[PDB]
Amino acid sequence: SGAIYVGNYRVVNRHLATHNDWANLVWEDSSRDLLVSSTTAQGCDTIARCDCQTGVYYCSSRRKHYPVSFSKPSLIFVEASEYYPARYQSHLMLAVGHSEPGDCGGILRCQHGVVGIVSTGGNGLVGFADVRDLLWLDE
Ligand SMILES: Cn1ccnc1[C@@H](c1ccccc1)N1C[C@@H](C(N)=O)CC1=O
Numbered sequence: 001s002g003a004i005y006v007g008n009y010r011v012v013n014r015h016l017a018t019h020n021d022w023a024n025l026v027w028e029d030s031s032r033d034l035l036v037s038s039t040t041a042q043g044c045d046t047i048a049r050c051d052c053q054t055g056v057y058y059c060s061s062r063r064k065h066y067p068v069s070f071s072k073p074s075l076i077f078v079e080a081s082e083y084y085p086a087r088y089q090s091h092l093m094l095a096v097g098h099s100e101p102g103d104c105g106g107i108l109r110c111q112h113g114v115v116g117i118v119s120t121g122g123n124g125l126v127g128f129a130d131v132r133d134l135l136w137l138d139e
Pocket residue numbers: 015033078079080081082083084089099100101102103104119120121122
C-alpha cells in the first residue's frame with residue numbers, strides 16, 4: 001500500500017483505489033495501473049521532472065529502502081492476476097529488486113523528487129508506474 005500526496009491530489013495504484021477514490025476521481029488509466037483522486041488537505045510531495053535512471057525505493061515486505069538502477073518508461077507485458085487480465089502496461093520501469101504483493105504503492109525517488117510507485121514484482125524484479133510525465137499534478 002501507499003500513495004503520493006502532491007497539491008490537492010492523491011496518486012495511488014488503480015487496483016488498490018477505494019470506492020471513495022472513485023467518487024473523488026480526477027483521472028485514471030487502467031493501462032498504467034494509476035488513479036488520481038482529489039483531496040481536501042494540501043500534500044507535501046514534489047514530483048520529479050527529469051530523466052534519472054537511478055533512485056531509491058521503499059520495500060514494505062523488507063522494511064527497507066533500496067538504491068536501484070531502473071529502465072526507461074515503456075510498454076511491458078504483465079501476466080494475469082486477480083486485478084487485471086494478461087495485458088501490456090504502459091509507462092512501466094523495471095529494476096532488479098524485491099517486490100511482493102503488498103509492496104505496491106512504495107515510492108521510488110531520485111534527487112529531484114518522486115519518480116513513481118511500485119506496481120509490479122516477482123522473479124527478482126520490481127516494476128514502477130512512472131508519474132514524471134503527469135505535469136498537471138503541479139498545478
Ligand atoms: C501479475 N503480476 C506480474 C508481475 N507482478 C504482478 C503482480 C505483483 C505486484 C507487485 C508485487 C508482486 C506481484 N501484480 C502487478 C499489478 C499490475 N500492475 O497489474 C497487479 C498485480 O497483482
